[PDB]
Amino acid sequence: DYRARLVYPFSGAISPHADIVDQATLAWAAMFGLLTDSLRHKSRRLQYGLLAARAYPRADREMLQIAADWIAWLFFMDDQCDETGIGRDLQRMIALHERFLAILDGATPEAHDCALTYALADLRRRLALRAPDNWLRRFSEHVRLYFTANRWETVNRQRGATPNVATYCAARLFSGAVYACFDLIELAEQIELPFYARHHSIVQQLEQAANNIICWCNDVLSYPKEMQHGDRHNLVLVIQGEHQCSLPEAIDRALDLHAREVATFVRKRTCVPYFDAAVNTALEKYVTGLQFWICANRDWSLTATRYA
Amino acid sequence: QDYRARLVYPFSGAISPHADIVDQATLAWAAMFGLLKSRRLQYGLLAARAYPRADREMLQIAADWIAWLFFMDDQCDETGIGRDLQRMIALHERFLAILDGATPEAHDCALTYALADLRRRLALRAPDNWLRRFSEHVRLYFTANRWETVNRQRGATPNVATYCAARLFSGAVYACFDLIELAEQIELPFYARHHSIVQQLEQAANNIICWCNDVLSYPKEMQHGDRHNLVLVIQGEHQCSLPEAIDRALDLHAREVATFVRKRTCVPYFDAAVNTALEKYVTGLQFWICANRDWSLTATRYA
Ligand SMILES: C/C=C(/C)CC/C=C(\C)CCCC(C)C
Ligand SMILES: C/C=C(/C)CC/C=C(\C)CCCC(C)C
Ligand SMILES: [Mg+2]
Ligand SMILES: [Mg+2]
Ligand SMILES: [Mg+2]
Ligand SMILES: [Mg+2]
Ligand SMILES: [Mg+2]
Ligand SMILES: [Mg+2]
């Protein structure tokens, strides 16, 4: 049971609003037309709101609902990228991303824009009511880098080229949109970090470690379904190619890198400099937020139908 | 004492063969926009050292941008506006509008017209992705300048940790590093541009450039009653002598140089093309480290 080796020296939590928020995410998906014909009875068991509830457990219900709807949006987009033809067609992906990028700049969707474009416009509108311009620009750029990473994946599929470990790990930090999900922690915890603390090297390194942990945990849990689709965006498959080793050996190596990255995150937590009382209180809420996300990803993924 | 002679690097810089005509054109450009002994400024000779392999057109943009930053900085650091947050906010709102692409008007100051000209010229050489990254680094520079202003108004000195974290933005070095891509005509993919070791190399280079400046600029900053200087922040935190504070600053500078050259040897192998472009970028960071020191040691600005 290699899944038992996905362990952390810290624990998570879930919002008491979990089920209400999950029901509302399904209703939101239906409203914006994101539910496919093949998802009729499967829709019930997606449980995207139960991931959001674990990721942002202290959030007010309104803010948690934006986070839940955003997480649903990312799953709907991701299954298009990873399980349909658009993920093998760079020109179709560029055309769609041009529409998403226009909407992120504040453009209103046109009559013939697709469901995902309208849904993204709804999330931007709702975040604009809750967040200042500074935040919206930072979130938008993390989302742009996620689209860039999806186009990078598409070229890999079109070329039949598995990236090396160094390239994969560097790109994977963007292909999961985890940095955009970290941006929501500020809104959930209602914290305003000053520029010098937000961008501090140790904070960047804690964010990088948490992102790696989440993505490599996902890779160990999602390699079966990704292999079923002939995909190559997975630390297990990337390690297997680089080392020319067995699948068990690649899984063992991936779980070693995951365990090492957890110890790096725990180590670097004690390396946050003292700025002042107020900044360090806010900063500790943000880093606690990263820990809730690490736990949310594993806790939800171990029980989710998505990886069954 | 010869403490300036301890600012050494285990590498050398270079200067563009176009240095003087660019310097003369920068001085002319500054006069044309009314931002302006003038011949002693030599802002073009900093740009020529920072971007030594740049085509003349691109070097001229970089030179006019460096001149702009110096003109802005002397308003912030030697003028009343740098002690007035409401007046700073008002001016920044006009800059942030021009950066988003808004046309200047009759009410806007010389710096606003000059910034609009630079954004126009950069928009002809760089894609939207670049303009956004550059604009955000400039935005963070303005934010750092307002942080400086509140420090002056409240007469507060930040601790070493706070000063060093903020100083990475108060110098606009990251905005200057963005111009390396255009100077070298390289396109780094997202995963390499934002890689942790690249970020750590940029941070080390920025710290080196800023702390070198601090050691050379503490006298003129003391004369203006300013406290945005590693030497002065160390003096306040450790309650030590000025010589001890300078020695402490130079030890941190030397350590950061050792960190930069060590982290160069930790750049991963992505692929042949990406690593070719990356070495041009990182070499660019080294040209900037040498440019800052080489120019500053002979500049009348720090005489
Ligand atoms: C982001 C992807 C991983 C694996 C980490 C957390 C999952 C999230 C935030 C929702 C899924 C968004 C898609 C990219 C699948
Ligand atoms: C940036 C500051 C240092 C000390 C190195 C490079 C100098 C430059 C790029 C212009 C000087 C004006 C700025 C302080 C606004
Ligand atoms: Mg994916
Ligand atoms: Mg997927
Ligand atoms: Mg996966
Ligand atoms: Mg100054
Ligand atoms: Mg200054
Ligand atoms: Mg100075």
Domain that holds residue A206: 2-6+15-307
Evaluate whether A222 touches A234 at the Cβ level (below 8 Å): yes
Collect all residues with Cβ–Cβ distance below 8 Å to A267 and sequence separation of at least 6: none
CA of residue A218 to ligand 5 center, whole Å: 5
CA of residue B77 to ligand 6 center, whole Å: 5
Hey, whose CA ends up nearest to atom 2 of ligand 2? B171
Method: X-ray
Taking CB atoms and an 8 Å limit, are A196 and B169 in contact across chains? yes
Nearest Cβ partner of A171 from B191, B199, B203?
B191
- In B, minimum Cα distance to A149 occurs at B190
Which residues of A are part of a known binding site for substrate? 172, 225, 306-307
Tokens of A190: 């209602």
Tokens of B275: 């690593």
- With a 6 Å cutoff on the Cβ, whether A180 touches ligand 1 is no
B33-38: long-range contacts at Cβ-Cβ below 8 A with a sequence spacing of 24 or more? B33/B110, B33/B113, B33/B114, B33/B117, B34/B110, B35/B67, B35/B68, B35/B71, B35/B110, B35/B111, B35/B114
Neighbouring CB atoms inside 10 A of A99's CB total 19
Torsion of CA B275, B276, B277, B280, to 10 degrees: 110
- Give the Cα separation of A189 and A198 in Å (integer): 14
Closest CA to A265 of A293, A238, A303, A236: A293
User: How far does the CA of residue A79 sit from the closest CA of chain B (Å)?
Assistant: 22
- Is any Cβ of chain B less than 8 angstroms from the Cβ of A11? no
Evaluate whether B63 touches B28 at the Cβ level (below 8 Å): no
User: How far does the CA of residue B303 sit from the closest CA of chain A (Å)?
Assistant: 31
C-alpha R_g of chain B: 19
Collect all residues with Cβ–Cβ distance below 8 Å to A191 and sequence separation of at least 6: A185, A282, A285, A286
- With a 6 Å cutoff on the Cβ, whether A104 touches ligand 1 is no
Closest CA to B74 of B35, B117, B31: B35
- In A, minimum Cα distance to B100 occurs at A105
User: What CATH number does residue A221 fall under?
Assistant: 1.10.600.10
Collect all residues with Cβ–Cβ distance below 8 Å to A220 and sequence separation of at least 6: A2, A3, A6, A235, A236, A251, A254, A255, A258
Provide the chain A residues 127-156 that lie in CB contact (below 8 A) with chain B: 137, 141, 144-145, 148-149, 152
- Is any Cβ of chain A less than 8 angstroms from the Cβ of B168? yes
Mutate to test the pocket of ligand 2, among B46, B72, B73 (most ligand atoms within 8 A of CB): B73
- Give the Cα separation of A201 and A139 in Å (integer): 19
Neighbouring CB atoms inside 10 A of B298's CB total 11
- Give the Cα separation of B180 and B282 in Å (integer): 9
CA of residue B172 to ligand 2 center, whole Å: 6
Spell out which residues of chain A touch residue B144, defining contact as CB-CB under 8 Å. Answer: 195-196
Taking CB atoms and an 8 Å limit, are A167 and B194 in contact across chains? no
Decide: helix, strand or coil at residue A205.
helix
Tokens of A154: 């598409």
CA of residue B88 to ligand 2 center, whole Å: 18
Q: What is the resolution of this structure in A?
A: 2.0
In ligand 2, which atom is closest to the CA atom of B173? 1
Neighbouring CB atoms inside 10 A of A243's CB total 12
Provide the residues around ligand 6 (an ion) whose CB is within 5 A: B 73, 77
User: How far does the CA of residue B164 sit from the closest CA of chain A (Å)?
Assistant: 9
Closest CA to B264 of B252, B250, B278, B276: B278
In ligand 2, which atom is closest to the CA atom of B70? 12
In ligand 2, which atom is closest to the CA atom of B141? 15
- Is any Cβ of chain B less than 8 angstroms from the Cβ of A278? no
DSSP chain B: --GGGG---SS-----TTHHHHHHHHHHHHHHTT---GGG--HHHHHHHHSTT--HHHHHHHHHHHHHHHHHHHHHHHSGGGG-HHHHHHHHHHHHHHHHTPPP-TTS-HHHHHHHHHHHHHHTTS-HHHHHHHHHHHHHHHHHHHHHHHHHHHT----HHHHHHHHHHHT-HHHHHHHHHHHHT----HHHHT-HHHHHHHHHHHHHHHHHHHHHHHHHHHHTT---SHHHHHHHHHT--HHHHHHHHHHHHHHHHHHHHHHHTT-----HHHHHHHHHHHHHHHHHHHHHHHHHHH-GGG-
- Give the Cα separation of A46 and A44 in Å (integer): 6
Tokens of A248: 């068990």
User: How far does the CA of residue B268 sit from the closest CA of chain A (Å)?
Assistant: 6
In ligand 2, which atom is closest to the CA atom of B175? 9
- Give the Cα separation of A220 and A224 in Å (integer): 9
Number of domain units in chain B: 1
- Give the Cα separation of B220 and A278 in Å (integer): 33
Provide the chain A residues 192-221 that lie in CB contact (below 8 A) with chain B: 194-197, 199-201, 204-205, 208
Termini Cα distance of chain A = 14
In ligand 1, which atom is closest to the CA atom of A180? 9
- In A, minimum Cα distance to B272 occurs at A167
Taking CB atoms and an 8 Å limit, are A196 and B162 in contact across chains? yes
Tell me how many residue pairs between chain A and chain B have CB atoms under 8 A apart.
72
- Give the Cα separation of A173 and A212 in Å (integer): 7
- Is any Cβ of chain A less than 8 angstroms from the Cβ of B268? yes
Residue located via tokens 């080229």: A161
